[PDB]
């Protein structure tokens, strides 16, 4: 019984990066080179694991995180990065064991006049901890005057829209991202490859 990767990679709606989705995968058999060999992804970088050997490995659990960002922000989805996304939206740990998979999704995600459903967090007092999801909408206080939930000067809604639009700038176009984390605990290894 296969792992529900298709449920993650082939979902027709993706989350905003600030509210990234996470499917916890377990008790299944995963053919990774289904993804490895399809060659549909502009990005497929793995850390702490050899992508081909993955079908020989077992893990306690696998986590699939998914979301949409800009093409030129996909570099921030990696261990040791800085920036809007790395700092305030989705943060990988320095000791990351998993794979980062991305592909251009302009066809599905760019809406004429601006697709204002995809957002990112723009203001935040402090960097995210790794694998932290912050969905706060509190009004961000940039001044000494408390905002009391009312927007205004120095009182900013913390989220910005991408407004993904038909644009000939590739970097500005939306990409769908899937991050695979591989968890190995002192428990049964319920997520195994074909070879074991």
């Amino acid at each position, epitope marked *: 019984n296969l792992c529900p990767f298709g449920e993650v990679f082939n979902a027709t709606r993706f989350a905003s990066v600030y509210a990234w989705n996470r499917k916890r995968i377990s008790n299944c058999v995963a053919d990774y080179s289904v993804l490895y060999n399809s060659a549909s992804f502009s990005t497929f970088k793995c850390y702490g694991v050899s992508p081909t050997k993955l079908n020989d490995l077992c893990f306690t659990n696998v986590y699939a995180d998914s979301f949409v960002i800009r093409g030129d922000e996909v570099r921030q989805i990696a261990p040791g990065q*800085t920036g809007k996304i790395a700092d305030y939206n989705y943060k990988l740990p320095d000791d990351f064991t998993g794979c980062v998979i991305a592909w251009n999704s302009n066809n599905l995600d760019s809406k004429v006049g601006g697709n204002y459903n995809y957002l990112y967090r723009l203001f935040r007092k402090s960097n995210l901890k790794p694998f932290e999801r912050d969905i706060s909408t509190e009004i961000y206080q940039a001044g000494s005057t408390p905002c009391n939930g009312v927007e205004g000067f120095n009182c900013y809604f913390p989220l910005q829209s991408y*407004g993904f639009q038909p644009t000939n700038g590739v970097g*500005y176009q939306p990409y769908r991202v899937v991050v695979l984390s591989f968890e190995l605990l002192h428990a049964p290894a319920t997520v195994c490859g074909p070879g074991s």
Partner: antibody, heavy 117, light 108 residues
Framework: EVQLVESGGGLVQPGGSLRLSCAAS????????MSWVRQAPGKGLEWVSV???????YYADSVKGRFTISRDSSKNTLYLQMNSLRAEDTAVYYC???????????WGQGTLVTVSS | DIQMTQPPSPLFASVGDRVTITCRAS??????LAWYQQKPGKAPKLLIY???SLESGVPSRFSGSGSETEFTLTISSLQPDDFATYYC?????????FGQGTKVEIKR
């Protein structure tokens, strides 16, 4: 009310150093994107450096390795440490609140830095 | 980098004229464009972000338009205090850059 006041500018020889200073009011430096932007005499505008509220900092390639942006939230102050100054660094240095994504919606009036031998 | 080109200075207009200042990005920046106004001896002040949204405070005679690689600032009826320099600036990329600026001086 809201204010950004630069100081520390002046005349310095090539190879010298200078620490710029930006005292803010009502703006809280440590909660904002704080930037330095400079303007050579009669020239245009050149972004220099940013410090995110979360700590991340970036620099124009023309100043990498030589300038260092920093802040003291005890004093609600932004700093720019300029080392190994060259004559091409001569400019008015502006302190600007970056309202996210390098959108400078408030500029201090600036402090001039002349690098010359 | 992305290089922003504006027209050369000066631009000559009279109080009441309609003035358009163009801006040309060397590559597509979608709509991430800003407009600043600067008087001599004074710091810039922001007028237009996201290409067409008036900064809160800026008089309504100021308007912005464009996308991709060509943009436009427009003063419907130029006022006496609108004689200044206007810079465009692409933001929301890894490194921001400004155009060289266009100065609007008095017509005679």
């Amino acid at each position: 009310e809201v204010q950004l006041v630069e100081s520390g500018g002046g005349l310095v020889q090539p190879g010298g150093s200078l620490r710029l200073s930006c005292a803010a009011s009502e703006f809280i430096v440590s909660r904002n994107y704080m930037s330095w932007v400079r303007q050579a005499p009669g020239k245009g505008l050149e972004w220099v450096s940013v410090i995110y509220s979360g700590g991340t900092t970036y620099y124009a390639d023309s100043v990498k390795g030589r300038f260092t942006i920093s802040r003291d939230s005890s004093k609600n102050t932004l700093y720019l440490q300029m080392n190994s100054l060259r004559a091409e660094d001569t400019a008015v240095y502006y302190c600007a609140r970056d309202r996210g994504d390098y959108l400078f919606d408030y500029w201090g009036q600036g402090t001039l830095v002349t690098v010359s031998s | 980098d992305i290089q922003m080109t504006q027209p050369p200075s000066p631009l000559f207009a009279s109080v009441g004229d309609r003035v358009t200042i163009t801006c040309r990005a060397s590559q597509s920046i979608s709509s991430w464009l800003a407009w600043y106004q600067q008087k001599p001896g004074k710091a810039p002040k922001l007028l237009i972000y996201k290409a067409s949204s008036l900064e809160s405070g800026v008089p309504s005679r100021f308007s912005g338009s464009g996308s991709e690689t060509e943009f436009t600032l427009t003063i419907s009826s130029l006022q006496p205090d609108d004689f200044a320099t206007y810079y465009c600036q692409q933001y929301n990329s890894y490194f921001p850059t400004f155009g060289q600026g266009t100065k609007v001086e008095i017509k005679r």
